[PDB]
Design a protein around this ligand. Sequence first.
Ligand SMILES: C[S@@+](CC[C@H](N)C(=O)[O-])C[C@H]1O[C@@H](n2cnc3c(N)ncnc32)[C@H](O)[C@@H]1O
Length: 178
Amino acid sequence: MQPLVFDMAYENYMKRKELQNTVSQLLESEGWNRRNVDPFHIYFCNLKIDGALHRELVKRYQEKWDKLLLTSTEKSHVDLFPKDSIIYLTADSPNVMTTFRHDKVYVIGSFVDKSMQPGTSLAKAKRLNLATECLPLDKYLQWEIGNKNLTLDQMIRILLCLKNNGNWQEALQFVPKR
Ligand SMILES: C[S@@+](CC[C@H](N)C(=O)[O-])C[C@H]1O[C@@H](n2cnc3c(N)ncnc32)[C@H](O)[C@@H]1O
């Protein structure tokens, strides 16, 4: 089964409100995955034991934390999968995605910043020499803009649709317009 990584290396950038939002978005994402008959194997990487995120899950969502269908680890995506197979997703990337690939491990940053902290994830990728891509939002949604920095549950639904052989118009229905 194809892995999909949520990178938990952003905790230091967030306040109590935004960390909470991140946790809400991750729970929602795992739920969309459980609905699908051809799901991803979800990995929570860089999840520091007894950090703010792990503590938030354990103190405030213990019942829900014990039943998620995923693998969580302190290790990095680069410690587990070969660098050649990694693609870090970020709206700041200069490479526009054209093709969903079944032999790649996509990485999504676990970060709610309200577009106030650009480049953050692009740099975390460059520093380890990882390939990056952005979603083709301009190409397939001229005007209707909104902000191009989507939520974590939006990203998984798009990628699920493409994984299950949907075209770009179908996949991008999950993007709120205006
Ligand atoms: C709210 S965004 C975070 C924006 C943050 N300032 C950053 O530096 O990425 C949440 C995550 O979803 C992914 N993402 C969001 N919108 C995307 C897009 N248009 N293309 C590719 N990845 C996207 C990225 O992995 C990003 O880390």
